[PDB]
Design a protein around this ligand. Sequence first.
Ligand code: WL6
Length: 134
Amino acid sequence: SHMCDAFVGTWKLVSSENFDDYMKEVGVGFATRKVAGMAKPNMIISVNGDVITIKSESTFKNTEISFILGQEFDEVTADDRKVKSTITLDGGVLVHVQKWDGKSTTIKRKREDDKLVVECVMKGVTSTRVYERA
Ligand SMILES: O=C(O)CCCc1nc(-c2ccc(Cl)cc2)no1
């Protein structure tokens, strides 16, 4: 057993708050916000050795990242930002920092009860997205 066992699995979005405002703050344009905000993604998390894979699949976009904790990687986000990302474990929370164009956003993923809670922060704007096991 290991590092991220309680994250691994298939998860489905069941609530969202403030995501349109988070997307605005990150710079997402109107049409992408409207379509992306309608999506109900499934989040699939797996681990193989030291490599963690997080997939997001929805009607809007399918994305996938694979990474080693603490080791920077390049990521193209669902809104087509070219970012440099680092994901660490901090006290049982996966902390994902994305840097681009002198900007930064942080996405935290945590297990709370039977849920996986995602908090996305850009400057003073936070969005909370709650996932349940599929
Ligand atoms: O998994 C979640 O639900 C949220 C965490 C992953 C994440 N997705 C986005 C995002 C940004 C822009 C656009 Cl268009 C669509 C998606 N930002 O953070």
